[PDB]
Structure 1
């Protein structure tokens, strides 16, 4: 059922993805790379004292603070959901091999018994109403670009000036490029305007992953992560194999001379993709206004800031169901891309723009280096984009694509299992739009708070409440999938956007509180995804610009965890044992140094201004801007801080572009 074409790097089709410059050529050829990360300035992730610390701390905390999660996956008591062994990884050393990305998810979806389109006309109206509400009366804003981000295919530039020029040129030529694609001239659109080509596959670390201690043997066991070989990926699973990657770290002693303590493993590696910037720029120019609309008009469902902001909504509910989605991005349906595109056309969106958007979700993928002596292969033909990878992580609107799919999926689940009395309100497009507009503002007896694959579903008092409890029971039993669209289950230890919903003895939302996840504090402080990048002089371009700043926001972020004080004391005691130093004093020094360094980047900040005007969100984001790509948005960050991390194309150029895309 159609194998995807594959081209080696030597092939002209793969060569055309890389411009005639050192950076692009190095990206094409980059071999498998691994090595210890610089966790903090002058500290490697594999430092024997650091690993000794992780061994003592993970064992102590698991022993003294076992998980408090009930039969229904509700967190209570200590606010702990699993053991603390997740920190036991040799950061910077990946599992081998990493997965080859699936070229087609059609078989994957069919085999999981998931629908190949909207099941009913009601569902079709609801998905289409989501498009109408999300993409209608948008306001133009500057096109914001992350500083130090790559333009990927074909230039691989990290220079802001070059990136601004590429983005402005893309907005000027998007119409001509989209019209060429409408004629089936994909090679012309790419050759002339760099719109097309492929996604560039980067493998990112998921620094912490499940590890258990087998009581029978006293040996640690790492969670098996299934990977697809090349044959499996190209055939959509028809041929080839799906097998457990090797997380065994014993190899590091032989290969690198690194002492590996017992129960330490190689990190989970996830596929991530970088989009061709010229194609993403016209998409981002529409995506940002869409986010501004949904986070303002539909703030109830979509705009999530603090633990208290989430708590205020959830406390009003009689039932709160914390859902889990299996492998969201790989299962994301291509029929939804086509439905969205068809609906945008119906709304009066420029057909050339819709074509660029459609093409961004069918694009070939260039596989770099999943393992030593593997990769350097283009999957799919750029002359006719026809892949079904699901949702590409570097597509200009991935957050919105996952949010659109999931918000409707959850609403459909509430309608099907709890609220058949609301079906009469969804008769046609105008009534579907009115209903959805009301539901998204939190005006119905059925409610939700969601972001991509994370959500909490709510029921107030009323007719749907009894159904709500049956649905929760069906999820606990876990024998029947409640959705025809995605694989849905309940979360083992219900949390929403990093905050754990801590229930008391009553196990009711009205007396439950949102608290910071103490395990995430440990993940962020002792298992960062990236090194400090001490060699990158411009800190705003680093993956972790100001790591020291996270110490200042720690009490605000995690202070509400029942075991906060206990964890900090355990850290202090273990760090003294391992380094013969005070961890608290070490972090206070790093905080001071990073605070001083920050003023160099903020125009409004004098030589030694201090953190006085900054919010806890500002500080968490400056230590980890990745939180701005999954947890928060632009409006949540102080304006002067957002400027440290992002730069924009003028609203004059985007305003003109937006006028040409949008209906009449």
Structure 2
């Protein structure tokens, strides 16, 4: 029932994905690599003192601050949702092997008893209404490009000058390329305009993942992570096997001479995909104005900033349900890509642009190195894009695709289980749009706050409130899936975008507060995803440009966690035991150094200006810009800080492009 075509690097089809230059060639061939990260400047993740510190700290904090999560997954008391053993990894050393990406999720979705299209006409209207609302009255903005990002297939350029040239040219030739694809001339669109080819698969690490301590044995147990072998990936699970990867870190002593303390493991590795920049540029040109619209007009549902910004919305609710989605991106339905495209066409969007958009979501995938002596294979034929990989992480609009799917999925779940009396308001397209526009503004008795897979669903006083409690009960029971579209459950310790919803004795949203997650502080400070990259001179290009700055925003971010002071004192005590130094002092020096270094990057900042003008968001982002990709958006960051991390193509170029795409 269709195995995906697979080509070795040797094959012309794979060869054609990599330009005749060194970076691109090296990317094609890059062998499985592993090794300790430079956690902080001059400190390795596998430093014995550092692992001793992690052993003492994880044990102490779990001991003294056991999880306070009720029967309904509501966090109370100390604001703790699990043990602190997730820090116990040999950062920079992955679990083996990493998964081969599934070329088609069709069987997987079907076997999970998920819908192959909208179930009812109402759902069809709602998904189409989401498209109408999201893509309608768009205002052109400059095409902003993250500094240090790669152009991936085929050039693998990291130079901003080159990236701007690529982007400008892509906006000029997108029409020509889209038209070629309409004529089924994919190789021509790729050859001429580098629009097509494949996604480039990279494996990134999830630095902290589940670990438990067996009381019987006193031995630690790492969470098993299932991986697909090559056969399973190409057949969409029809053949091949799905098995647990190995997180055993014993191998590091024999291979590298690294002493592995007991209860320390290899890191979980997640697949990431980098899009062909020329194809992403025209998509992003539309996706950015879409974000602006939804974060402004539909700010209630979509625009999330501080813990208090969230609290203001949730306090008004009589019931708050924090939901959880089962591997969201991989399960994302291709029928939705087709629906979206169909509706954009009906809206009057340029068919050539829609084709580029459609194509971006059917593209082949080049697998790098999932394990030693494995990989270097192209899955799918770029001559006729037809993969069903779910949602690709490097697609120009992924966040919008996940947000669109999920927002409607949760609304449908609220309609089906709690608000049948609202069904009458969704009769046709104009009524579906009117209803959704109101729902998204927080104007109905059923409400939600979401960002892709993360969400909190609300009920005010009314007819639906009782249904809301029955739904919550269904979720607690966990025997029936409340959605036909995705596998939904309730979150064990409800949190929204890294803020824990801290309930009191009343267990009511009105009495509840959003607090920073202290575990996420520990994740960020001791288990960074990347090393310091002290090699990379231009700090704005690094994965962690100014690590030291995080110390300055810490109290604002984490200060409201009940155990904040206790944790910081525990850190100090444990760091003294391990290094014979003050952690606080160490961080203050790093903060001073990074504050001084920052002034070199900020035009407004005098030779020693001081963090005066900077917000806590600005600081958290400069220490970790990945937070700008999942927790915040561009508009949440100060003007001067934005310019450190991004650069844009003029609004004059985009404005002309946008006019040619959009209806009338």
Both structures adopt the same fold (TM-score exceeding 0.5): yes
> How far off its partner does 1:129 sit?
0.1
SS class of match (2:71): coil
CA distance in 1, matches of 2:540, 2:148: 8
Corresponding position: 1:253 with 2:253: yes
Does residue 324 of structure 2 align to residue 324 of structure 1?
yes
**Residue 437 (structure 1) aligns with:** 437
Report deviation, 1:53. Answer: 0.1
Q: Deviations over 1:325-364 (max 9, x none)?
A: 0000000000000000000000000000000000000000
Deviation of 1:572 after TM superposition, in Å, equals: 0.2
Q: Give the aligned partner of residue 160 of structure 2.
A: 160
TM-aligned CA deviation for residue 524 of structure 1: 0.1
Q: CA deviation at 1:5?
A: 0.2
Kindly state the Cα deviation for residue 102 of structure 1 after the two structures are TM-superposed.
0.2
Report how many residues are paired: 664
* d(CA) in 2 for partners of 1:440, 1:331: 24
Aligned with 1:449: secondary structure?
strand
- Please, what TM-score do these two structures have when normalized by structure 2? 1.00
Shift of 1:621: 0.2
Deviations 1:159-193 (Å, cap 9, x if unpaired)?
00000000000000000000000000000000000
User: Which SS does the other structure have where 1:177 is aligned?
Assistant: helix
* Alignment correspondent of 2:447: 447
The CA deviation at 1:62 is 0.2
SS at match of 1:500: strand
CA offset digits 1:395-420 (Å, max 9, x no partner) = 00000000000000000000000000
- Aligned to 2:515, the other structure's residue is in SS state strand
Partner of 1:338, secondary structure, is helix
What SS is found at the alignment partner of 1:657?
Answer: helix
Shift, 1:136, TM fit:
0.2
* CA deviation after TM superposition for structure 1 residue 509, in Å: 0.3
Aligned-pair distance for 1:378? 0.2
Q: Structure 2: how far apart are the matches of 1:199 and 1:345?
A: 25
Distance between the aligned counterparts of 2:16 and 2:187, measured in 1? 10
SS of the residue 1:73 aligns to: coil
Partner-residue secondary structure (3-state), 2:258: coil
Number of the residue aligned with 1:78: 78
Q: Distance in 2 between matches of 1:565 and 1:603?
A: 36
Paired with 1:589 and 1:231, the residues of 2 have a C-alpha distance of 52
Give the deviation of 1:377 after TM superposition. Answer: 0.2
Deviation per CA, 1:305-327, whole angstroms, max 9, x where unpaired?
00000000000000000000000
Describe the SS at the equivalent of 1:515: strand
1:230-270: CA deviations, max 9, x gaps? 00000000000000000000000000000000000000000
Q: What is the CA-CA distance between 1:644 and the residue it aligns to?
A: 0.2
Runs of 4+ in 1 over 2 A off after TM superposition: none
User: How far apart are the structure 2 equivalents of 1:216 and 1:17?
Assistant: 53
Deviation at 1:433, TM superposition (A): 0.2
State how far apart, in whole Å, the 1-side matches of 2:99 and 2:663 are.
41
1:289 deviates by 0.1
Q: Secondary structure at the match of 1:227?
A: strand
Cα separation, 2, equivalents of 1:201 and 1:44? 27
Q: CA deviation at 1:290?
A: 0.1
Tell me if 1:26 matches 2:23.
Answer: no
1-structure distance, mates of 2:216, 2:13: 54
Q: How much does 1:9 deviate?
A: 0.2
> In the alignment, is residue 131 of structure 1 matched against residue 125 of structure 2?
no
C-alpha separation between the residues in 2 aligned to 1:406 and 1:642? 29
The Cα shift of 1:537 comes to 0.2
Distance in structure 1 (CA, Å) of the matches to 2:22 and 2:635 = 37
TM-score, normalised with respect to structure 1: 1.00
User: Which blocks of at least 5 consecutive residues in structure 1 are unaligned?
Assistant: none
Following superposition, the deviation at residue 7 of structure 1 comes to 0.2
Shift of 1:90: 0.2
C-alpha distance in 1, partners of 2:533/2:51?
Answer: 21
Instruction: Compute the displacement of 1:456 (Å).
Output: 0.1
Deviation at 1:550, TM superposition (A): 0.2
Structure 1: distance between partners of 2:430 and 2:508:
36
Q: CA deviation at 1:273?
A: 0.3
Deviation per CA, 1:124-172: give whole Å up to 9, x if none.
0000000000000000000000000000000000000000000000000
* CA RMSD in angstroms, aligned pairs only: 0.2
Cα deviation, residue 226, structure 1: 0.2
Aligned equivalent of 2:186? 186
For 1:496 and 1:119, locate their aligned partners in 2 and report how far apart those are by CA, in whole Å: 29
- CA displacement, residues 392-445 of structure 1 (integer Å, 9 cap, x when unaligned): 000000000000000000000000000000000000000000000000000000
Q: Distance in 2 between matches of 1:64 and 1:186?
A: 60
Give 1:513 deviation, angstroms.
0.2
Partner in structure 2 of residue 199 of structure 1: 199
SS for the counterpart of 2:613 is: coil
What is the alpha-carbon distance in structure 2 between the residues aligned to residue 594 and residue 436 of structure 1? 46
**Quick check: 1:486 aligned with 2:489?**
no
Deviations 1:548-567 (A, max 9, x none): 00000000000000000000
- Unaligned 5+ residue runs, structure 2? none
Identify the residue that residue 603 of structure 1 maps to in structure 2. 603
Q: Which residues in structure 2 correspond to 1:139-288 (within 5 Å)?
A: 139-288=139-288
What is the distance in 2 between the residues matched to 1:447 and 1:38?
Answer: 44
Deviation at 1:587, TM superposition (A): 0.1
Between the aligned partners of 1:555 and 1:510, the Cα distance in structure 2 is: 24
Cα shift at 1:109: 0.3
Output the CA distance in 2 between the equivalents of 1:86 and 1:556.
Answer: 24
Q: Compute the displacement of 1:508 (Å).
A: 0.4
Between the aligned partners of 1:295 and 1:484, the Cα distance in structure 2 is 28
